[PDB]
Amino acid sequence: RTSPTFRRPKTLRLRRQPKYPRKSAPRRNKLDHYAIIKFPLTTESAMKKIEDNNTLVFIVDVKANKHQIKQAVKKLYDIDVAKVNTLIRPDGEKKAYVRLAPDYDALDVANKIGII
Amino acid sequence: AKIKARDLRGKKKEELLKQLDDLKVELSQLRVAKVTGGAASKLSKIRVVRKSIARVLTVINQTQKENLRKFYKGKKYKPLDLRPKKTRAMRRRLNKHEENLKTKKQQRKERLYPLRKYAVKA
RNA sequence: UCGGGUUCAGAUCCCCGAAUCUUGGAAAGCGUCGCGGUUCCGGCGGCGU
RNA sequence: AACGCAGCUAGCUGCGAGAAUUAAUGUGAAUUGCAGGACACAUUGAUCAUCGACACUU
């Protein structure tokens, strides 16, 4: 003993091996891509963005982050996303500005939803 | 054309998700019709299509459970949601076996002196 | 992380361009002088800085 | 306790992202303000009630 202080010795710690799972089955993912996108938006100011900025406007779930929004729109409408800008409306809904890649165009795509 | 619960029960798991997926897809399209100009006939379809989501999702959730029930039917330990719920207090009481447990002293007592039926003339 | 544009309402957040004395830079912007168009052209030029 | 959920919906009420309800059983042609949707009513089903299955955001 070269030190005057006594420290608690480190002992073995076993990883928990439950005899049974406390939850019978994994909880289902209740916030999916269809939950990510609520509906597209059609206001007058919105239309300017699809034409001049190659950007789509969407009302999304308030709990979705920018990464979650980007993946959902890609697999929902088979397009590529450059960047997404989000804000929380005064009414409490989250609005997302999703800008498509330059190779895709928002005009023909927004026809496919039927919004444009 | 009308989704009904009992015909979906015997249907296999894989296409149930396939049945779930498109119904979600039509539901998304109906929401697109709402924000734009929407026909009244179209605006009637959200409620029915929403209930089919519940109807289908109820099936899988109902379908998923009993396999876990029969999987754990004979096992010593069950998941907490598969055990009987009842009431918190009623789960703490002694099981029917213990409340019938009786000591050696009493067993000698009841066999030696059983309660008898009798009548008194008057 | 700045410059210039952009809305009826947002800009160091949107778009463009640059990043983390000269290159940037004149192409921009700003003054004036004109030509097109009249809910379309959000299109053109001339000088000067 | 909060926040959301109705085709048109603020409150009350009901409900919980399956959100003015899912399943099942009983019942048996409606709900209703408007429209739409329904509706062989067993080759089995609107509404309501019951409620034991499932689900139940912070």
CA distance A104 to A21: 47
> Where is A11: in which H helix or E strand?
none
Taking CA atoms, B43 is separated from B23, B39, B98, in Å, by: 15, 6, 61
CA distance A96 to A69: 8
Residue type at position A95:
K
CB-based contact B25:A75 (threshold 8 Å): no
Interface test with chain A among B21, B32, B59, by most A beta carbons within 10 Å: B32
- List of chain B residues whose C-beta atoms are within 8 Å of the C-beta of residue A114: 29, 32-33, 36
Resolution value, angstrom units: 2.7
Concatenated DSSP letters for B105-119? HHHHHHHHS------
**Nearest chain B Cα to A41, which residue?**
B35
CB-based contact A65:A71 (threshold 8 Å): no
Residue type at position A93:
E
Concatenated DSSP letters for B33-60? HHHS---HHHHTHHHHHHHHHHHHHHHH
CB-based contact B48:B26 (threshold 8 Å): no
CB-based contact B63:B13 (threshold 8 Å): yes
CA distance B113 to B116: 9
CA distance A109 to B21: 21
Alpha carbons within 13 angstroms on the beta-carbon side of residue B45 total 19
And the tokens for A48?
């300017």
CA(B76)–C1'(D26) in Å? 38
Residues near A97 by beta carbon (within 8 Å), at least 6 away in sequence: A49, A55, A56, A57, A84, A85, A86
Q: What is the DSSP-derived secondary structure letter of residue B82?
A: G
Q: What is the largest CA-CA distance in chain B?
A: 96
Method: cryo-EM
